[PDB]
Amino acid sequence: KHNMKAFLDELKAENIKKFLYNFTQIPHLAGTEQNFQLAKQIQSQWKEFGLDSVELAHYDVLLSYPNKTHPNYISIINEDGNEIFNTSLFEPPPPGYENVSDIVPPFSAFSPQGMPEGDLVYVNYARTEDFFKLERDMKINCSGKIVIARYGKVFRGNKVKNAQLAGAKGVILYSDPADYFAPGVKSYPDGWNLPGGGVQRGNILNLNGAGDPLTPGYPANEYAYRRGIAEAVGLPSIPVHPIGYYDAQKLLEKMGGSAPPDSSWRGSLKVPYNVGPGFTGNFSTQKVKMHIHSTNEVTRIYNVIGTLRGAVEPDRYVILGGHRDSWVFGGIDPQSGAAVVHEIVRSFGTLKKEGWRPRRTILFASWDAAEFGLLGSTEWAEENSRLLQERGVAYINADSSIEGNYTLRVDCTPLMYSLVHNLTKELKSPDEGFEGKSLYESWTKKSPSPEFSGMPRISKLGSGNDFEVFFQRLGIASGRARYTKNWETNKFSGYPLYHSVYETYELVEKFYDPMFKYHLTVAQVRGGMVFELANSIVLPFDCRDYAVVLRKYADKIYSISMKHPQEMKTYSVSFDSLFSAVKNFTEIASKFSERLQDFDKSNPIVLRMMNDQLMFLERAFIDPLGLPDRPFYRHVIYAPSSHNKYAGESFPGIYDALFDIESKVDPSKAWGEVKRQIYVAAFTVQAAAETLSEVA
């Protein structure tokens, strides 16, 4: 039989290992020749694997690169203007890679040029709340100051934005061992920890879903009209550079001024973590000087797009997509993902050569320039928006397959909760001590749901990865899955070697997944999801799961508002309409579920009607007017958090209207806008519900 089991059994750990090794020997930075060559290889292999068509889709987008003959660096500079300390020009390359060319040195992509000079201020993680504490409680003024912040907690772009709005003239980012050095584990190459010379690369854009900064709304094709750099979306306005903790210790050790307000402002370096401004009396005459010469350049990028045509519904698209571009070798990010996608394509292709086709069309994507703002996925979605919104069933992301080896992590739309539970009950756990048990069992034991005993945690989709255009702009049901760490035992952030030169094949092979069993499990989850989405006769979405979470989110947003009872009285702020809409959604979803079970399974138009209602349900949560000042974030239920692009926020329109509302100067206007957002949310929920009513 050609069934999901045949698909799953053909997937091999050893193939994934082989592909990972193949993908990680040289750097594959977006816009470079090496990443074009890898795109061509992938295209060629996907054809060999049996896909019906495989094309490159290219775009000319704004990228950012250091200047090869004028390196970026930071100095301590004395009263005489002598540079007494310089940060590193590159990370010490790992063993055996010391002769690899084109390792891009650490830099913050899209930094403007500058040589700003001034006094340091230490801003902890540069979060909204960290700045509120500096300005409001400690009375410290960042205007004209070079701010130094530790990576972590939130997306680095949010940090640079928060810094800019506080008036800083420069940002230095660093990795504190408190956040990137797991206790008792060796530094690379002898374990998986960040060494003192390791540095986290990364873009510092605030695109809010726009894609290429120069062409918001429209693909960056050959005839594209581009904004001028001055009108570009999302570029930082002050220079920024990342450093490791050895270099950071040299810049922090002399800090004077105010003490840290508490232990949550202190990392693990042997320094006071004084906020500043400036250095201590002996050194109060010294200052910090940045030297940033990176340039922004319109550069060609290449997505690989593979098609496996559906036998029955070729006009319905299930997309499996992940990025190919890396900062350096991409051992985890993204090649642990891409290797999995490669094997999934190979397995579907095997079935296809034996005469099988999925019911629906499967699209496979190798996205470019994700590291520079999700540009490849976004540009392609902008080009094909009409096709995607009328034909897009679901999107399954495929970035890094592992960030740990403890248990499964799933983030998805509530429409896929049931699919995920049912699939994981049929997969084997790869975990130690769960031999012969299901993935569902090991996952549920290690990551229990905070609400329901006997079920696992599934998180909301936020952003910061290539599902973003599909889910938050277009309203296509989306999900992602990977192996992760134990967040209880490990307070540290992401994984220590994230976006560093030390993210290699050897890192993975030696320290994360020697048997490639966690990779195989992830291939089975991602692959299995795609298989069911593309082959199940009735789409495997349970609208009733949406009803459940909508009530939870309405309860939560109401709780936030109810911190201001006097204002709710004064401005007649009622959540009644939102609760009524959620109630109606629950009732109508329940009736729809009955019809979907009891409908005449013989009739294909009836089947197609009800599959269309399921497909367009996620779509119904899109507001074509977007969110305030964020036209590309259109999902009324989910939007990336305005304080941390990484995290999901629910009813973001109402949440943002309530945020820090007690500080607004005109409370009548601010509570008016809360009421407006309540109306918009209620209406949207009711409108979504009504898509599931009988059609006529």
Ligand X SMILES: *[C@@H]1O[C@H](CO)[C@@H](O)[C@H](O)[C@H]1NC(C)=O
Ligand Y SMILES: *[C@@H]1O[C@H](CO)[C@@H](O[C@@H]2O[C@H](CO)[C@@H](O)[C@H](O)[C@H]2NC(C)=O)[C@H](O)[C@H]1NC(C)=O
Ligand Z SMILES: *[C@@H]1O[C@H](CO)[C@@H](O[C@@H]2O[C@H](CO)[C@@H](O[C@@H]3O[C@H](CO)[C@@H](O)[C@H](O[C@H]4O[C@H](CO)[C@@H](O)[C@H](O)[C@@H]4O)[C@@H]3O)[C@H](O)[C@H]2NC(C)=O)[C@H](O)[C@H]1NC(C)=O
Ligand U SMILES: *[C@@H]1O[C@H](CO)[C@@H](O[C@@H]2O[C@H](CO)[C@@H](O[C@@H]3O[C@H](CO)[C@@H](O)[C@H](O)[C@@H]3O)[C@H](O)[C@H]2NC(C)=O)[C@H](O)[C@H]1NC(C)=O
Nearer to ligand BC8, 310 or 494 (CB): 494
Q: Is 399 in the site for Cl ion (CB under 5 A)?
A: yes
SS3 assignment, position 477: strand
Tokens of 474: 């277009």
- 387 makes contact, choosing from ligand BC8, a copy of itself, Zn ion, none, with CB < 5 to 8 Å by partner type, with a copy of itself
Burial of 98 (0-12, 13-18, 19+ CB in 10 A): exposed
Q: For the window 331-370, what string marks contact with ligand BC8 as x by the rule CB under 6 A? A: --x------------------------------------x
* 233 in contact with ligand U (CB under 6 A): no
Q: Which strands, in side-by-side order, build the sheet including 170-174?
A: 120-122, 146-150, 170-174, 240-243
Q: Interface with a copy of itself includes 612 (CB under 8 A)?
A: yes
Candidates 215-223, 396-404, 541-549, 672-680; binding stretch for Cl ion (CB under 5 A): 396-404
Q: What is the DSSP letter of 299?
A: E
Q: Is 368 in the site for Zn ion (CB under 5 A)?
A: no
- Binding range to ligand U, per CB under 6 A, among 85-93, 415-423, 674-682, 684-692: 415-423
Please identify, using beta-carbon distances, which residue of 255 and 332 lies nearer to ligand X: 332
How, if at all, do strands 392-397 and 477-484 pair? parallel
Interface residue with ligand BC8 among 94, 198, 494, 648 (CB under 6 A) is 494
Give least dist CB 419 to ligand U, A.
5
Residues 6+ apart with CB under 8 A from 694: 595
- Are 170 and 116 contacting, i.e. CB atoms less than 8 angstroms apart? yes
Residue whose CB is less far from ligand Z, 232 or 581: 581
Q: Indicate the helix (H) or strand (E) that contains 473.
A: none
List of residues contacting ligand Z (CB under 6 A): 222, 577, 580-581, 584, 682, 686
The CA distance from 273 to 123, in Å, is: 10
Phi, psi of 35, deg, nearest 5:
-80, -30
In terms of CB distance, is 70 or 425 closer to ligand U? 425
Site string for a copy of itself, 115-154 (x = CB under 8 A): ----------------------------------------
Q: CB of residue 680 vs ligand Z: minimum separation in angstroms?
A: 12
In the DSSP assignment, the letter for residue 359 is S
**Distance between CA 297 and CA 64 in Å, rounded?**
6
Q: Does 653 bind ligand BC8 (CB under 6 A)?
A: no
Residue 295 interacts with which of ligand X, ligand Y, ligand BC8, none, CB < 5 to 8 Å by class: ligand X
Q: Least CB distance from residue 66 to ligand Z, whole Å?
A: 23
Q: Does 519 bind Cl ion (CB under 5 A)?
A: no
In angstroms, what is the minimal distance from the CB of 494 to ligand BC8?
A: 5
Q: Which of 307, 392, 308 is nearest to 357 (CA)?
A: 308
> Residue 394 or residue 678: which is nearer to ligand Z going by CB?
678
CA nearest neighbour of 476 among 284, 319, 371, 630 = 319
Residue 674, CA atoms < 13 Å, CB-side half-sphere: 26
Residue 404 engages ligand X in binding (rule: CB under 6 A): yes
- Considering only residues 395 to 434 of the shown chain, the ones binding ligand Y according to CB under 6 A are none
Please state, in angstroms and rounded to a whole number, the distance separating the CA atoms of residues 494 and 482. 13
Q: Taking the CB of residue 611, how many other CB atoms lie within 10 A of it?
A: 21
Check binding of 480 to Cl ion (CB under 5 A).
Answer: yes
| Distance of closest approach, residue 299 Cβ to ligand Y, in angstroms | 23
128, 208, 397, 686: residue in contact with Cl ion (rule CB under 5 A): 397
Q: Residue 306 Cβ, how far from ligand Y at the closest point, in Å?
A: 14
Residues 91, 96: Cα–Cα separation, whole Å: 14
Would you say 568 and 543 are in contact if contact means Cβ atoms under 8 Å apart?
no
What is the spatial distance between Cα 120 and Cα 50, in angstroms, rounded to a whole number? 58
Using the rule CB under 8 A, which residue among 235, 243, 427, 678 binds a copy of itself? 678
Task: Identify the three-state secondary structure at position 222.
Answer: coil
Identify the residue among 14, 79, 83, 354 touching ligand Y (CB under 6 A).
83
Angle, CA 201 vertex, CA 195 and CA 207 arms, to 5° = 150
Give 40 or 563: the residue with its C-beta nearer to ligand Y. 40
If the CB atoms of residues 468 and 623 are measured against Zn ion, the closer one turns out to be: 468
Q: Which of helix, strand or coil describes residue 2? A: coil
Under the criterion CB under 6 A, does residue 41 sit at the interface with ligand Y? yes
Indicate which single residue of 3, 25, 285, 663 sits in contact with ligand Y (rule: CB under 6 A).
25
> Nearest-CA neighbor of 208 among 378, 341, 62, 337?
378
Per partner kind, with CB cut-offs from 5 to 8 A, the member of a copy of itself, ligand X, ligand BC8, none near residue 70 is ligand X
Gap sites in the chain (C to N > 2.5 Å), preceding residue numbers: none
Q: Do 622 and 474 meet the contact criterion of CB atoms below 8 Å apart? A: yes
Window contacting ligand U (CB under 6 A); options: 58-66, 140-148, 232-240, 417-425: 417-425
Nearest to 410 by CA among 472, 467, 457: 457
- DSSP codes of every residue in 227-268: --GGG-SS--SS-EEEE-HHHHHHHHTTB-BBPPSSGGG--S
Part of the chain binding ligand X (CB under 6 A), chosen from 34-42, 141-149, 334-342, 622-630: 141-149
CA distance 377 to 400: 16
Q: How far apart are CA 384 and CA 219, in angstroms?
A: 9
In the list 267, 373, 540, 653, the residue contacting ligand U (rule: CB under 6 A) is: 540
Q: Does 688 bind a copy of itself (CB under 8 A)?
A: yes
* Residue 132 contacts ligand Y per CB under 6 A: no
Closer to ligand Z at the Cβ: 222 or 451? 222
Please select the residue that binds ligand U; options are 258, 418, 438, 691, rule is CB under 6 A.
Answer: 418
The answer to whether 441 touches 359, Cβ cutoff 8 Å, is no
Q: Which is nearer to ligand BC8, 202 or 239 (CB)?
A: 202
Q: Does 84 bind ligand Y (CB under 6 A)?
A: yes
- Tally Cβ neighbours within 10 Å of residue 356: 16
Near ligand Y by CB under 6 A: residue from 45, 124, 296, 686: 45
Q: How far is the CB of 606 from Cl ion (least distance, A)?
A: 35
Minimum distance from residue 481 beta carbon to ligand X (Å): 18
Give 578-592 as a 3 state SS string. Answer: HHHHHHHHHHHHHHH
Residue 430's Cα: distance from chain center in Å? 26
Q: Which of 7, 646, 651, 671 binds ligand BC8 (CB under 6 A)?
A: 646
Q: 434 to 493, contacts with ligand X by CB under 6 A?
A: 485
The residue type at 137: D
**Helix (H) or strand (E) segment spanning residue 194:** none
User: Nearest-CA neighbor of 403 among 508, 302, 557?
Assistant: 508
The rounded distance, in Å, linking the Cα atoms of 171 and 295 is 17
Residue whose token pair is 């977006």: 30
Place of tokens 């698909």: 7
- Footprint of a copy of itself (CB under 8 A): 52, 217-219, 221, 223-225, 307, 309-310, 312-315, 317, 361, 383-387, 390-391, 576-577, 604-605, 608-609, 612, 616, 619-620, 624-625, 631, 672, 675-676, 678-680, 682-683, 687-688, 690-691, 695-696
Q: Give the interface with ligand X as residue ranges (CB under 6 A).
A: 67, 69-70, 141, 143-144, 192, 293, 295, 404-405, 485, 511-512
Which residues bind to ligand BC8, rule: CB under 6 A? 202-203, 333, 370-371, 373-374, 399, 464-465, 494, 645-646
Residue numbers of the site for Zn ion (CB under 5 A)? 333-334, 399
Positions touching ligand Y (CB under 6 A) are 22, 25, 41, 44-45, 83-86
Q: Which residues bind ligand U (CB under 6 A)?
A: 418-419, 422, 540, 542, 597
